[model samples]
Target: VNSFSGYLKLTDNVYIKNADIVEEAKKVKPTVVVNAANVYLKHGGGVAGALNKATNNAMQVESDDYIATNGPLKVGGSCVLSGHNLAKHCLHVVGPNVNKGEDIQLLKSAYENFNQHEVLLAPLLSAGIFGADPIHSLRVCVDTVRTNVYLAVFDKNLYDKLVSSFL
Candidate 1:
Protein backbone atom coordinates (compact mmCIF):
# COMPACT_ATOMS: atom_id res chain seq x y z
CA VAL A 1 0.00 0.00 0.00
CA ASN A 2 1.08 3.56 -0.62
CA SER A 3 1.01 4.70 2.97
CA PHE A 4 2.54 7.89 4.34
CA SER A 5 4.21 8.69 7.63
CA GLY A 6 2.32 10.59 10.32
CA TYR A 7 1.39 14.12 9.37
CA LEU A 8 2.45 17.33 11.07
CA LYS A 9 -0.48 19.67 11.13
CA LEU A 10 0.23 23.31 10.61
CA THR A 11 -3.38 24.50 10.75
CA ASP A 12 -6.91 23.18 10.54
CA ASN A 13 -6.30 22.28 6.91
CA VAL A 14 -2.58 22.42 6.25
CA TYR A 15 -0.44 19.33 6.89
CA ILE A 16 2.89 17.79 5.95
CA LYS A 17 3.51 14.23 4.89
CA ASN A 18 6.57 12.14 4.22
CA ALA A 19 5.96 10.42 0.94
CA ASP A 20 7.10 10.28 -2.65
CA ILE A 21 5.32 13.31 -4.10
CA VAL A 22 4.81 11.91 -7.54
CA GLU A 23 3.35 8.68 -6.23
CA GLU A 24 1.23 10.34 -3.61
CA ALA A 25 -0.05 12.91 -6.07
CA LYS A 26 -1.20 10.13 -8.33
CA LYS A 27 -3.02 8.47 -5.49
CA VAL A 28 -4.58 11.46 -3.76
CA LYS A 29 -5.35 13.39 -6.97
CA PRO A 30 -5.47 16.83 -5.49
CA THR A 31 -6.89 19.81 -7.37
CA VAL A 32 -3.40 20.92 -8.25
CA VAL A 33 -0.02 19.23 -8.16
CA VAL A 34 2.72 21.81 -7.83
CA ASN A 35 6.07 21.78 -9.61
CA ALA A 36 9.07 23.55 -8.17
CA ALA A 37 9.59 25.07 -11.58
CA ASN A 38 12.41 27.11 -12.98
CA VAL A 39 12.08 30.54 -14.53
CA TYR A 40 11.95 29.00 -17.99
CA LEU A 41 9.37 26.43 -16.90
CA LYS A 42 11.56 23.67 -18.29
CA HIS A 43 10.74 20.27 -16.91
CA GLY A 44 14.36 19.24 -16.80
CA GLY A 45 15.18 17.76 -13.40
CA GLY A 46 14.08 17.04 -9.86
CA VAL A 47 10.31 17.36 -9.27
CA ALA A 48 9.84 18.98 -12.64
CA GLY A 49 11.53 16.12 -14.47
CA ALA A 50 9.57 13.50 -12.58
CA LEU A 51 6.22 15.22 -13.20
CA ASN A 52 7.16 15.80 -16.81
CA LYS A 53 7.77 12.11 -17.28
CA ALA A 54 4.63 11.15 -15.40
CA THR A 55 2.45 13.32 -17.61
CA ASN A 56 4.12 11.99 -20.75
CA ASN A 57 5.63 15.39 -21.49
CA ALA A 58 2.27 16.98 -22.08
CA MET A 59 3.19 19.64 -19.54
CA GLN A 60 6.36 20.38 -21.45
CA VAL A 61 4.42 21.21 -24.57
CA GLU A 62 1.97 23.36 -22.63
CA SER A 63 4.79 25.07 -20.78
CA ASP A 64 6.59 25.74 -24.01
CA ASP A 65 3.45 27.34 -25.36
CA TYR A 66 3.04 29.38 -22.20
CA ILE A 67 6.57 30.74 -22.23
CA ALA A 68 6.42 31.36 -25.93
CA THR A 69 3.46 33.64 -25.31
CA ASN A 70 4.23 35.04 -21.85
CA GLY A 71 8.03 34.89 -21.71
CA PRO A 72 9.97 33.32 -18.83
CA LEU A 73 8.22 33.28 -15.49
CA LYS A 74 9.80 35.50 -12.87
CA VAL A 75 10.78 34.52 -9.34
CA GLY A 76 7.64 34.03 -7.19
CA GLY A 77 5.51 34.05 -10.34
CA SER A 78 3.25 31.15 -11.30
CA CYS A 79 0.85 29.74 -13.88
CA VAL A 80 -1.66 26.94 -13.79
CA LEU A 81 -1.92 24.51 -16.68
CA SER A 82 -3.64 21.29 -17.52
CA GLY A 83 -2.27 18.46 -15.40
CA HIS A 84 -2.59 16.13 -18.41
CA ASN A 85 -2.73 12.82 -16.54
CA LEU A 86 -1.78 13.48 -12.95
CA ALA A 87 -4.49 15.81 -11.65
CA LYS A 88 -7.01 18.40 -12.71
CA HIS A 89 -4.40 21.10 -12.87
CA CYS A 90 -0.70 21.72 -12.27
CA LEU A 91 0.70 24.88 -10.70
CA HIS A 92 4.18 25.86 -11.83
CA VAL A 93 5.80 28.30 -9.43
CA VAL A 94 9.25 29.80 -9.81
CA GLY A 95 11.23 29.84 -6.61
CA PRO A 96 14.16 32.10 -5.81
CA ASN A 97 17.63 31.11 -6.97
CA VAL A 98 19.88 31.86 -4.02
CA ASN A 99 22.98 31.82 -6.22
CA LYS A 100 21.46 34.78 -8.05
CA GLY A 101 20.90 36.74 -4.80
CA GLU A 102 17.21 35.92 -4.52
CA ASP A 103 16.19 35.69 -0.89
CA ILE A 104 13.61 34.14 1.40
CA GLN A 105 10.92 36.67 0.56
CA LEU A 106 10.89 35.52 -3.05
CA LEU A 107 10.63 31.95 -1.91
CA LYS A 108 7.78 32.89 0.38
CA SER A 109 6.12 34.74 -2.46
CA ALA A 110 6.24 31.63 -4.60
CA TYR A 111 4.37 29.70 -1.94
CA GLU A 112 2.03 32.56 -1.20
CA ASN A 113 0.96 33.00 -4.79
CA PHE A 114 0.06 29.34 -5.10
CA ASN A 115 -1.74 29.06 -1.78
CA GLN A 116 -5.15 29.83 -3.26
CA HIS A 117 -5.78 26.30 -4.36
CA GLU A 118 -8.35 24.30 -2.42
CA VAL A 119 -6.34 21.09 -2.38
CA LEU A 120 -2.68 21.28 -3.24
CA LEU A 121 0.14 18.77 -3.42
CA ALA A 122 3.40 20.66 -3.23
CA PRO A 123 7.05 20.04 -2.54
CA LEU A 124 9.46 22.13 -0.52
CA LEU A 125 9.92 25.07 -2.86
CA SER A 126 13.46 26.34 -3.52
CA ALA A 127 15.01 23.72 -1.26
CA GLY A 128 16.71 21.78 -4.03
CA ILE A 129 18.58 23.21 -7.01
CA PHE A 130 17.24 26.67 -6.30
CA GLY A 131 19.36 26.49 -3.07
CA ALA A 132 17.00 27.58 -0.27
CA ASP A 133 17.67 25.86 3.05
CA PRO A 134 15.36 22.86 3.35
CA ILE A 135 14.30 23.52 6.93
CA HIS A 136 13.66 27.16 6.18
CA SER A 137 11.66 26.19 3.15
CA LEU A 138 9.56 23.88 5.28
CA ARG A 139 8.93 26.67 7.72
CA VAL A 140 7.90 28.97 4.94
CA CYS A 141 5.49 26.37 3.65
CA VAL A 142 3.91 25.82 7.06
CA ASP A 143 3.70 29.51 7.70
CA THR A 144 2.14 30.50 4.38
CA VAL A 145 -0.44 27.89 3.58
CA ARG A 146 -3.93 28.13 5.09
CA THR A 147 -5.84 25.63 2.95
CA ASN A 148 -5.80 21.88 2.52
CA VAL A 149 -2.13 21.66 1.71
CA TYR A 150 -0.07 18.52 1.72
CA LEU A 151 3.67 19.05 1.75
CA ALA A 152 4.81 15.98 -0.11
CA VAL A 153 8.37 15.20 0.84
CA PHE A 154 10.44 12.72 -1.19
CA ASP A 155 13.66 12.42 0.80
CA LYS A 156 13.52 10.31 3.92
CA ASN A 157 16.34 12.25 5.56
CA LEU A 158 14.66 15.59 4.92
CA TYR A 159 11.39 14.14 6.15
CA ASP A 160 13.07 12.99 9.32
CA LYS A 161 14.67 16.36 9.81
CA LEU A 162 11.33 18.15 9.43
CA VAL A 163 9.65 15.70 11.76
CA SER A 164 12.40 16.03 14.36
CA SER A 165 12.27 19.80 14.30
CA PHE A 166 8.50 20.29 14.19
CA LEU A 167 6.91 17.27 15.73
Candidate 2:
Protein backbone atom coordinates (compact mmCIF):
# COMPACT_ATOMS: atom_id res chain seq x y z
CA VAL A 1 0.00 0.00 0.00
CA ASN A 2 2.97 2.33 -0.53
CA SER A 3 0.94 3.79 -3.37
CA PHE A 4 -1.72 4.57 -0.82
CA SER A 5 0.83 6.02 1.56
CA GLY A 6 2.73 8.38 -0.78
CA TYR A 7 1.85 12.04 -0.45
CA LEU A 8 3.43 15.45 -1.14
CA LYS A 9 3.27 18.94 0.31
CA LEU A 10 1.62 22.01 -1.07
CA THR A 11 2.05 24.43 1.83
CA ASP A 12 5.07 24.60 4.07
CA ASN A 13 3.18 22.75 6.80
CA VAL A 14 0.46 21.06 4.69
CA TYR A 15 0.78 17.48 3.35
CA ILE A 16 -1.46 15.22 1.28
CA LYS A 17 -1.75 11.42 0.98
CA ASN A 18 0.30 9.63 -1.71
CA ALA A 19 -2.93 8.01 -2.84
CA ASP A 20 -3.77 11.39 -4.46
CA ILE A 21 -1.31 10.90 -7.32
CA VAL A 22 -2.70 7.46 -8.19
CA GLU A 23 -6.26 8.71 -7.89
CA GLU A 24 -5.52 11.83 -9.94
CA ALA A 25 -3.82 9.80 -12.68
CA LYS A 26 -6.85 7.61 -12.89
CA LYS A 27 -9.25 10.51 -12.88
CA VAL A 28 -7.38 12.69 -15.37
CA LYS A 29 -7.41 12.22 -19.10
CA PRO A 30 -4.57 10.14 -20.48
CA THR A 31 -1.60 11.99 -21.92
CA VAL A 32 -3.08 11.51 -25.36
CA VAL A 33 -6.31 10.30 -26.88
CA VAL A 34 -6.28 8.45 -30.14
CA ASN A 35 -9.06 7.76 -32.63
CA ALA A 36 -10.80 5.67 -30.06
CA ALA A 37 -11.18 6.05 -26.32
CA ASN A 38 -7.89 4.27 -25.84
CA VAL A 39 -5.50 5.89 -23.40
CA TYR A 40 -1.99 6.84 -24.51
CA LEU A 41 0.47 7.58 -21.78
CA LYS A 42 3.80 9.39 -22.00
CA HIS A 43 6.88 9.21 -19.87
CA GLY A 44 9.53 11.86 -19.15
CA GLY A 45 10.31 14.70 -21.60
CA GLY A 46 13.76 13.16 -22.25
CA VAL A 47 14.40 12.32 -25.93
CA ALA A 48 14.64 8.53 -25.72
CA GLY A 49 12.02 8.30 -23.06
CA ALA A 50 9.69 10.54 -25.02
CA LEU A 51 10.20 8.51 -28.17
CA ASN A 52 9.35 5.26 -26.40
CA LYS A 53 6.46 6.93 -24.66
CA ALA A 54 5.01 8.26 -27.88
CA THR A 55 5.55 4.93 -29.58
CA ASN A 56 3.67 3.17 -26.86
CA ASN A 57 0.89 5.70 -27.10
CA ALA A 58 0.63 5.41 -30.86
CA MET A 59 0.58 1.63 -30.70
CA GLN A 60 -2.07 1.63 -28.05
CA VAL A 61 -4.14 4.01 -30.11
CA GLU A 62 -3.81 1.99 -33.31
CA SER A 63 -4.60 -1.30 -31.60
CA ASP A 64 -7.74 0.09 -30.03
CA ASP A 65 -8.81 1.72 -33.29
CA TYR A 66 -8.55 -1.56 -35.20
CA ILE A 67 -10.36 -3.53 -32.56
CA ALA A 68 -13.16 -1.04 -32.18
CA THR A 69 -13.70 -0.47 -35.89
CA ASN A 70 -13.55 -4.05 -37.20
CA GLY A 71 -14.15 -6.07 -34.09
CA PRO A 72 -17.87 -6.32 -34.81
CA LEU A 73 -17.42 -7.30 -38.44
CA LYS A 74 -19.17 -10.64 -38.79
CA VAL A 75 -17.35 -13.56 -40.41
CA GLY A 76 -20.35 -13.12 -42.70
CA GLY A 77 -21.95 -15.52 -45.20
CA SER A 78 -21.50 -16.54 -48.82
CA CYS A 79 -24.68 -15.22 -50.44
CA VAL A 80 -24.34 -13.08 -47.34
CA LEU A 81 -20.64 -12.46 -47.02
CA SER A 82 -20.35 -11.82 -50.72
CA GLY A 83 -22.72 -8.93 -50.12
CA HIS A 84 -24.38 -9.66 -53.44
CA ASN A 85 -26.68 -12.08 -55.26
CA LEU A 86 -26.27 -15.76 -56.35
CA ALA A 87 -28.55 -15.33 -59.40
CA LYS A 88 -26.04 -16.80 -61.86
CA HIS A 89 -25.10 -19.11 -59.02
CA CYS A 90 -28.40 -20.15 -57.47
CA LEU A 91 -26.70 -21.42 -54.36
CA HIS A 92 -23.34 -20.63 -52.88
CA VAL A 93 -21.63 -23.59 -51.23
CA VAL A 94 -19.64 -22.41 -48.23
CA GLY A 95 -18.05 -23.79 -45.06
CA PRO A 96 -16.89 -27.13 -43.57
CA ASN A 97 -16.22 -30.67 -44.92
CA VAL A 98 -17.90 -29.94 -48.24
CA ASN A 99 -14.61 -28.35 -49.21
CA LYS A 100 -12.03 -28.51 -46.48
CA GLY A 101 -8.94 -27.86 -48.56
CA GLU A 102 -10.92 -25.50 -50.75
CA ASP A 103 -10.41 -22.85 -48.13
CA ILE A 104 -6.66 -23.34 -48.31
CA GLN A 105 -6.89 -23.39 -52.10
CA LEU A 106 -8.81 -20.16 -52.13
CA LEU A 107 -6.25 -18.60 -49.87
CA LYS A 108 -3.53 -19.82 -52.22
CA SER A 109 -5.43 -18.37 -55.13
CA ALA A 110 -5.59 -15.00 -53.47
CA TYR A 111 -1.91 -15.24 -52.73
CA GLU A 112 -1.29 -15.69 -56.43
CA ASN A 113 -3.16 -12.45 -57.17
CA PHE A 114 -3.84 -13.24 -60.79
CA ASN A 115 -5.27 -10.86 -63.37
CA GLN A 116 -7.54 -13.57 -64.75
CA HIS A 117 -10.16 -12.86 -62.10
CA GLU A 118 -10.73 -10.59 -59.18
CA VAL A 119 -10.78 -11.88 -55.64
CA LEU A 120 -14.04 -11.43 -53.82
CA LEU A 121 -14.39 -11.50 -50.08
CA ALA A 122 -15.42 -14.94 -48.88
CA PRO A 123 -15.29 -16.96 -45.73
CA LEU A 124 -12.76 -19.75 -45.68
CA LEU A 125 -13.22 -22.62 -43.18
CA SER A 126 -13.99 -20.04 -40.57
CA ALA A 127 -12.59 -19.87 -37.08
CA GLY A 128 -15.35 -22.14 -35.86
CA ILE A 129 -13.80 -25.59 -35.59
CA PHE A 130 -16.01 -28.62 -36.17
CA GLY A 131 -14.50 -32.06 -35.54
CA ALA A 132 -15.47 -35.79 -36.02
CA ASP A 133 -19.22 -35.30 -35.92
CA PRO A 134 -18.89 -32.36 -38.24
CA ILE A 135 -22.36 -32.08 -39.74
CA HIS A 136 -24.28 -30.51 -36.88
CA SER A 137 -21.27 -28.57 -35.75
CA LEU A 138 -20.51 -27.50 -39.29
CA ARG A 139 -24.11 -26.58 -39.84
CA VAL A 140 -24.12 -24.50 -36.72
CA CYS A 141 -20.97 -22.69 -37.78
CA VAL A 142 -21.99 -22.20 -41.40
CA ASP A 143 -25.65 -21.63 -40.85
CA THR A 144 -24.91 -19.07 -38.21
CA VAL A 145 -22.43 -17.34 -40.51
CA ARG A 146 -25.18 -16.07 -42.82
CA THR A 147 -25.39 -18.40 -45.90
CA ASN A 148 -22.13 -20.19 -45.29
CA VAL A 149 -21.96 -23.51 -47.16
CA TYR A 150 -20.69 -26.48 -45.24
CA LEU A 151 -19.87 -29.71 -47.01
CA ALA A 152 -20.24 -33.07 -45.38
CA VAL A 153 -17.19 -35.30 -44.96
CA PHE A 154 -17.92 -37.14 -48.18
CA ASP A 155 -18.36 -33.98 -50.23
CA LYS A 156 -15.17 -32.46 -48.88
CA ASN A 157 -13.17 -35.54 -49.77
CA LEU A 158 -14.79 -35.72 -53.18
CA TYR A 159 -14.06 -32.08 -53.92
CA ASP A 160 -10.44 -32.60 -52.93
CA LYS A 161 -10.14 -35.56 -55.27
CA LEU A 162 -11.80 -33.70 -58.12
CA VAL A 163 -9.69 -30.61 -57.58
CA SER A 164 -6.56 -32.76 -57.45
CA SER A 165 -7.34 -33.86 -61.01
CA PHE A 166 -7.18 -30.23 -62.20
CA LEU A 167 -3.95 -29.66 -60.31
Candidate 3:
Protein backbone atom coordinates (compact mmCIF):
# COMPACT_ATOMS: atom_id res chain seq x y z
CA VAL A 1 0.00 0.00 0.00
CA ASN A 2 1.13 3.62 -0.60
CA SER A 3 2.04 5.70 2.41
CA PHE A 4 3.37 9.23 2.94
CA SER A 5 6.77 9.11 4.51
CA GLY A 6 8.35 11.97 6.49
CA TYR A 7 10.15 12.93 3.27
CA LEU A 8 6.96 14.66 2.11
CA LYS A 9 7.18 18.30 3.19
CA LEU A 10 4.88 21.23 2.61
CA THR A 11 5.97 24.27 0.48
CA ASP A 12 9.66 23.35 0.29
CA ASN A 13 8.90 20.44 -2.00
CA VAL A 14 5.43 19.00 -2.27
CA TYR A 15 2.66 21.61 -2.39
CA ILE A 16 -1.06 21.88 -2.97
CA LYS A 17 -2.08 25.01 -4.94
CA ASN A 18 -5.70 26.12 -4.95
CA ALA A 19 -5.39 27.93 -8.29
CA ASP A 20 -6.68 26.52 -11.50
CA ILE A 21 -4.15 25.15 -13.98
CA VAL A 22 -3.54 28.45 -15.79
CA GLU A 23 -3.57 30.62 -12.69
CA GLU A 24 -1.31 28.28 -10.80
CA ALA A 25 1.09 28.11 -13.71
CA LYS A 26 1.22 31.89 -13.88
CA LYS A 27 1.80 32.34 -10.16
CA VAL A 28 4.52 29.73 -9.88
CA LYS A 29 6.00 30.69 -13.26
CA PRO A 30 7.22 27.14 -13.26
CA THR A 31 9.90 25.94 -15.58
CA VAL A 32 7.34 23.62 -17.02
CA VAL A 33 3.58 23.09 -16.81
CA VAL A 34 2.45 19.55 -17.36
CA ASN A 35 -0.66 18.78 -19.33
CA ALA A 36 -2.46 15.51 -18.75
CA ALA A 37 -2.98 14.94 -22.43
CA ASN A 38 -3.86 11.77 -24.28
CA VAL A 39 -1.96 9.85 -26.94
CA TYR A 40 -3.78 11.64 -29.74
CA LEU A 41 -2.75 15.08 -28.48
CA LYS A 42 -6.40 15.91 -28.20
CA HIS A 43 -6.75 19.08 -26.20
CA GLY A 44 -10.52 19.15 -26.45
CA GLY A 45 -11.16 18.09 -22.88
CA GLY A 46 -9.88 17.92 -19.35
CA VAL A 47 -6.57 19.59 -18.47
CA ALA A 48 -5.62 19.56 -22.11
CA GLY A 49 -8.64 21.65 -22.96
CA ALA A 50 -7.83 24.24 -20.33
CA LEU A 51 -4.19 24.41 -21.43
CA ASN A 52 -5.15 24.61 -25.07
CA LYS A 53 -7.43 27.53 -24.42
CA ALA A 54 -4.91 29.26 -22.19
CA THR A 55 -2.09 29.20 -24.71
CA ASN A 56 -4.47 30.27 -27.44
CA ASN A 57 -4.33 26.76 -28.90
CA ALA A 58 -0.56 26.92 -29.17
CA MET A 59 -0.17 23.83 -27.05
CA GLN A 60 -2.52 21.95 -29.33
CA VAL A 61 -0.63 23.01 -32.44
CA GLU A 62 2.68 21.91 -31.01
CA SER A 63 1.20 18.72 -29.62
CA ASP A 64 -0.39 17.95 -32.97
CA ASP A 65 2.94 18.31 -34.72
CA TYR A 66 4.60 16.14 -32.13
CA ILE A 67 2.08 13.40 -32.73
CA ALA A 68 2.38 13.74 -36.49
CA THR A 69 6.12 13.33 -36.32
CA ASN A 70 5.93 10.55 -33.81
CA GLY A 71 3.01 8.23 -33.47
CA PRO A 72 0.48 8.50 -30.69
CA LEU A 73 2.11 9.28 -27.35
CA LYS A 74 2.08 6.27 -25.04
CA VAL A 75 1.09 6.11 -21.41
CA GLY A 76 3.78 7.81 -19.33
CA GLY A 77 4.89 9.39 -22.60
CA SER A 78 5.61 13.10 -23.03
CA CYS A 79 6.57 15.82 -25.50
CA VAL A 80 7.37 19.51 -25.13
CA LEU A 81 5.22 22.47 -26.20
CA SER A 82 6.76 25.88 -26.37
CA GLY A 83 6.09 29.52 -27.33
CA HIS A 84 3.20 29.78 -24.92
CA ASN A 85 1.74 32.14 -22.35
CA LEU A 86 2.14 29.70 -19.47
CA ALA A 87 5.67 28.61 -18.71
CA LYS A 88 8.85 28.64 -20.68
CA HIS A 89 7.69 25.24 -21.81
CA CYS A 90 4.81 22.82 -21.39
CA LEU A 91 5.13 19.06 -21.17
CA HIS A 92 2.34 17.05 -22.68
CA VAL A 93 2.10 13.80 -20.77
CA VAL A 94 -0.31 11.08 -21.66
CA GLY A 95 -2.56 10.47 -18.69
CA PRO A 96 -3.18 6.84 -17.78
CA ASN A 97 -6.56 5.16 -17.95
CA VAL A 98 -7.09 3.95 -14.42
CA ASN A 99 -10.07 1.84 -15.38
CA LYS A 100 -7.45 -0.22 -17.20
CA GLY A 101 -5.81 -0.99 -13.82
CA GLU A 102 -2.59 1.00 -14.35
CA ASP A 103 -2.82 4.08 -12.17
CA ILE A 104 0.08 4.56 -9.79
CA GLN A 105 2.69 2.95 -12.00
CA LEU A 106 1.62 4.93 -15.01
CA LEU A 107 1.40 8.15 -13.05
CA LYS A 108 4.89 7.60 -11.66
CA SER A 109 6.23 6.87 -15.11
CA ALA A 110 4.68 10.03 -16.52
CA TYR A 111 6.07 12.17 -13.74
CA GLU A 112 9.49 10.61 -14.17
CA ASN A 113 9.50 11.15 -17.91
CA PHE A 114 8.80 14.88 -17.68
CA ASN A 115 11.64 17.32 -18.28
CA GLN A 116 13.43 18.17 -15.05
CA HIS A 117 12.71 21.66 -13.78
CA GLU A 118 13.12 23.78 -10.68
CA VAL A 119 9.35 24.02 -10.43
CA LEU A 120 6.68 21.84 -11.96
CA LEU A 121 2.93 21.94 -11.48
CA ALA A 122 0.67 19.08 -12.45
CA PRO A 123 -2.89 17.98 -11.99
CA LEU A 124 -3.92 14.58 -10.63
CA LEU A 125 -3.18 12.53 -13.72
CA SER A 126 -6.07 10.36 -14.90
CA ALA A 127 -8.36 11.79 -12.28
CA GLY A 128 -10.43 13.58 -14.89
CA ILE A 129 -11.36 11.82 -18.10
CA PHE A 130 -10.12 8.41 -17.00
CA GLY A 131 -11.87 8.86 -13.68
CA ALA A 132 -9.04 7.68 -11.49
CA ASP A 133 -9.89 8.11 -7.82
CA PRO A 134 -8.87 11.67 -6.81
CA ILE A 135 -7.33 10.67 -3.48
CA HIS A 136 -5.34 7.88 -5.07
CA SER A 137 -4.17 10.20 -7.81
CA LEU A 138 -2.95 12.78 -5.29
CA ARG A 139 -1.10 10.09 -3.35
CA VAL A 140 0.60 8.85 -6.49
CA CYS A 141 1.79 12.33 -7.50
CA VAL A 142 3.09 13.16 -4.03
CA ASP A 143 4.68 9.76 -3.57
CA THR A 144 6.35 9.69 -6.98
CA VAL A 145 8.09 13.04 -6.76
CA ARG A 146 8.96 14.52 -3.41
CA THR A 147 10.41 17.88 -4.49
CA ASN A 148 9.31 20.82 -6.65
CA VAL A 149 5.93 19.26 -7.26
CA TYR A 150 2.77 21.32 -7.11
CA LEU A 151 -0.68 19.81 -7.32
CA ALA A 152 -2.93 22.26 -9.21
CA VAL A 153 -6.51 22.01 -8.05
CA PHE A 154 -9.15 24.13 -9.82
CA ASP A 155 -12.17 23.19 -7.80
CA LYS A 156 -12.41 24.62 -4.29
CA ASN A 157 -14.04 21.42 -3.12
CA LEU A 158 -11.26 19.36 -4.64
CA TYR A 159 -8.59 21.60 -3.15
CA ASP A 160 -10.20 21.33 0.27
CA LYS A 161 -10.35 17.57 -0.12
CA LEU A 162 -6.64 17.41 -0.89
CA VAL A 163 -5.71 19.68 1.99
CA SER A 164 -7.83 17.61 4.34
CA SER A 165 -5.99 14.52 3.22
CA PHE A 166 -2.69 16.08 4.25
CA LEU A 167 -4.16 17.19 7.59
* Winning model by lDDT: 1
> Per-residue CA lDDT of candidate 3, range 1-167, in tens?
11212222444467666668886676556677888888898889878898889888877787778878888988887887782888878877776877666655687787675436656777878887777777777776666665476677777798777778763
Model 1 TM-score (2 dp): 0.90
Cα-lDDT of candidate 3: 0.72
Report lDDT (CA) for all predictions.
0.82, 0.24, 0.72
Please list all clashing residue pairs in model 1, or write none if there are none: none
Worst 10 residues of 2 by lDDT: 32-41
Cα-based lDDT at residue 133, candidate 1: 86
**Model 2 agreement with the true structure over 43-112: per-residue lDDT tens digits:** 2322212222434454334334544654521111121111111111111222222223333223222212
C-alpha TM-score for every candidate: 0.90, 0.18, 0.83
RMSD of 2: 25.8
lDDT of 3 at 76: 87
Error of 1 at 33 (Å): 0.6
- Which model, 2 or 3, shows the larger TM-score? 3
